[PDB]
Design a protein around this ligand. Structure first.
Ligand SMILES: CC(=O)N[C@@H]1[C@@H](O)[C@H](O[C@@H]2O[C@H](COS(=O)(=O)O)[C@H](O)[C@H](O)[C@H]2O)[C@@H](CO)O[C@H]1O
Ligand SMILES: [Ca+2]
Length: 128
């Protein structure tokens, strides 16, 4: 079921999970919840998501509560500003510490509670 895009395979889940249970599922398949580091990757993901919400590898880290990628890609605040839905991250209820892809637009990301269940997207490097 994995889809190939620019040197990576992607798994769009059929079953919803909390953010961490999803990450654990990805890790069990030698992958991680997906990072997003280019407009073309953002586009590939939101087009494939077809208007549905999917957990991605976005999650808060450090005392500052800075966003980070679970796959350890450094998070680039400047280059990522364009990828959030206007108004997000809005940290609703002081309890939105993980990130999903929501809107079918380059401006797609939202922060939501880690314990909410959504479909999720794993990313796995292809190694020739
Ligand atoms: C107890 C409760 O239901 N609280 C509501 C909040 O969830 C909600 O805050 C919004 O939550 C959405 C969730 O989007 S999601 O991807 O489906 O998880 C967005 O994150 C949005 O940014 C938040 O403002 C507020 C507003 O609808 O209503 C509360 O009652
Ligand atoms: Ca939010």
């Amino acid at each position: 079921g994995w889809k190939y895009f620019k040197g990576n395979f992607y798994y769009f889940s059929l079953i919803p999970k909390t953010w961490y249970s999803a990450e654990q599922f990805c890790v069990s398949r030698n992958s991680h919840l997906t990072s997003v580091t280019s407009e073309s990757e953002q586009e590939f993901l939101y087009k494939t998501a077809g208007g549905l919400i999917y957990w991605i590898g976005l999650t808060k880290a450090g005392m500052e509560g800075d966003w980070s990628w679970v796959d350890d890609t450094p998070f680039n605040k400047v280059q990522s500003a364009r990828f959030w839905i206007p108004g997000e991250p809005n940290n609703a209820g002081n309890n939105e510490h993980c990130g999903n892809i929501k809107a079918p637009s380059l401006q797609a990301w939202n922060d939501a509670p880690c314990d909410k269940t959504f479909l999720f997207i794993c990313k796995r490097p292809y190694v020739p």
